[PDB]
């Protein structure tokens, strides 16, 4: 009300409204799902178009051979944060000859987003990210919020109508975690999960976007006729 003019101002109940408004931009964004087993980690993203003549906005970005994310909200902010991850993953490789841990990648994103919430002049990031990766401690899935909060999860979903997919994963928890050494079945579970967030529209060939990473599987993105198999 009077305490939402900038990010440097707490409200009387201890709330940061500019951060909460940035959080709102994510809810307006298109749905995206993340889930993992012990061997693989999968991202499934519903891409959004402007109209029938337009292309479908890309949702998934590769960060390294073993790591990448899907976005929901302001796409340019995802480009900034993914670029930062690319550099951090790269610094770890060049200096220490070491693949960046997914947990540590989350910690770096948290700290970068935080600085924007405590300083005058700037603004919070207006995007939520789902980071997947395979490192020395196996498969991982992270959920990034621009408040700074990063959370490691078995599965999750963010964006519009994401509560439906999140409930499905909460039921299926015991099943999909056990899908080891079978990428196609893990994607099937992800495609079935994102389907719980659909209304009116359905998953078409240029609508769906899938990405996977695993034990002997580099981070690869599937679009177009490459995902027709899963429709």
Partner 1 sequence: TQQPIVTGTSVISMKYDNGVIIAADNLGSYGSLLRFNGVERLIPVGDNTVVGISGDISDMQHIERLLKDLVTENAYDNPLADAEEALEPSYIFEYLATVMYQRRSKMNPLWNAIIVAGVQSNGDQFLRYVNLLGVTYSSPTLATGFGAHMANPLLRKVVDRESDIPKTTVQVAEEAIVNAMRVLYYRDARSSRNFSLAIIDKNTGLTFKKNLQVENMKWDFAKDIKGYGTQKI
Partner 2 sequence: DRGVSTFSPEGRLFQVEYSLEAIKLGSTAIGIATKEGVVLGVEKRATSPLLESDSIEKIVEIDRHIGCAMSGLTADARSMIEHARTAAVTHNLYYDEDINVESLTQSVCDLALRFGELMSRPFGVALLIAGHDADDGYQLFHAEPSGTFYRYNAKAIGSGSEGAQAELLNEWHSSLTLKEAELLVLKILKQVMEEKLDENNAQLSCITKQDGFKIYDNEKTAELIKELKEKEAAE
Partner 3 sequence: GSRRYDSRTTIFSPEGRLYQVEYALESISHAGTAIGIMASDGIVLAAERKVTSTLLEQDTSTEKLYKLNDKIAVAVAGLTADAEILINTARIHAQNYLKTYNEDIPVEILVRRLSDIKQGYTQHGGLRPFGVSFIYAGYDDRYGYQLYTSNPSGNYTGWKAISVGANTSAAQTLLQMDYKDDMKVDDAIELALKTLSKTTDSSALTYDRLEFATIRKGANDGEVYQKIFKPQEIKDILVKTGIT
Which chain residues interact with partner 2 by CB under 8 A?
4-6, 17-18, 21-28, 49-55, 57, 73-76, 79, 121-124, 126
| Closer of 135 and 143 to partner 1 (Cβ) | 135
Binding characters for partner 1, 30-59, by CB under 8 A (x = yes) = ------------------------------
| Closer of 12 and 121 to partner 3 (Cβ) | 121
Among 8, 173, 205, 228, binds partner 3 (CB under 8 A): 8
- Bridge partners, residue 134, by sequence: 139
Beta-carbon count within 10 A of 134 CB:
25
Q: Which residues contact 136 (CB under 8 A, 6 or more apart)?
A: 99, 101
- Bridge partners, residue 158, by sequence: 32
Any idea what DSSP says for residue 178?
A: T
- Bridge partners, residue 155, by sequence: 35
Give which of 225, 81, 76, 183 is closest to 142, Cα–Cα. 81
Among 51, 96, 121, 201, binds partner 3 (CB under 8 A): 121
Among 6, 103, 180, 185, binds partner 3 (CB under 8 A): 6
Spatial distance between the Cα atoms of 87 and 54, rounded to a whole number of angstroms: 31
Among 52, 120, 137, 171, binds partner 1 (CB under 8 A): 137
| Closer of 13 and 137 to partner 1 (Cβ) | 137
Count the site residues for partner 1 by CB under 8 A.
Answer: 11
Any idea what DSSP says for residue 148?
A: S
Q: What is the CA radius of gyration of the chain?
A: 18
Residue 75 binds which one of partner 2, partner 1, partner 3, none, with CB within 5 to 8 A depending on kind?
partner 2
Binding characters for partner 1, 182-211, by CB under 8 A (x = yes) = ------------------------------
CB of 127 to partner 3, least distance (A): 24
Among 12, 13, 54, 95, binds partner 1 (CB under 8 A): 95
Give which of 197, 230, 192, 187 is closest to 72, Cα–Cα. 197
Spatial distance between the Cα atoms of 137 and 16, rounded to a whole number of angstroms: 35
Measured at the CA of 97, the angle between CA 94 and CA 98, to 5 degrees, comes to 110
Q: Are 46 and 31 in contact (CB under 8 A)?
A: yes
Residue 96 binds which one of partner 2, partner 1, partner 3, none, with CB within 5 to 8 A depending on kind?
partner 1
Write out the residues near partner 1 by the rule CB under 8 A.
Answer: 94-98, 101, 103-104, 107, 136-137
Q: Using CB under 8 A as the criterion, which residues of the chain lie in contact with partner 3 when the complex forms?
A: 6, 8, 120-121
């Amino acid at each position: 009300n009077n305490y939402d003019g900038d990010t440097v101002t707490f409200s009387p109940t201890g709330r940061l409204f500019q951060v909460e408004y940035a959080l709102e931009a994510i809810k307006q964004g298109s749905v995206t799902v993340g889930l993992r087993s012990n061997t693989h980690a999968v991202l499934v993203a519903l891409k959004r178009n402007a109209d029938e003549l337009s292309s479908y906005q890309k949702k998934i970005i590769k960060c390294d051979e073993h790591m990448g994310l899907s976005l929901a909200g302001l796409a340019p902010d995802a480009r900034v944060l993914s670029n930062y991850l690319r550099q951090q993953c790269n610094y770890s490789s060049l200096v220490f000859n070491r693949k960046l841990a997914v947990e540590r990648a989350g910690h770096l994103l948290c700290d970068k987003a935080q600085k924007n919430t405590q300083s005058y002049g700037g603004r919070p990031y207006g995007v939520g990210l789902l980071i997947i990766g395979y490192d020395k401690s196996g498969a991982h899935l992270l959920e990034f919020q621009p408040s700074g909060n990063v959370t490691e999860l078995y599965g999750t979903a963010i964006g519009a109508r994401s509560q439906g997919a999140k409930t499905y994963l909460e039921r299926t928890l015991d099943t999909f975690i056990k899908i080891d050494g079978n990428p196609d079945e893990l994607i099937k579970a992800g495609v079935e999960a994102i389907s719980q967030s659909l209304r009116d529209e359905s998953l078409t060939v240029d609508n769906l976007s899938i990405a996977i990473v695993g034990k002997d599987t580099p981070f690869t993105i599937y679009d177009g006729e490459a995902v027709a198999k899963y429709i």
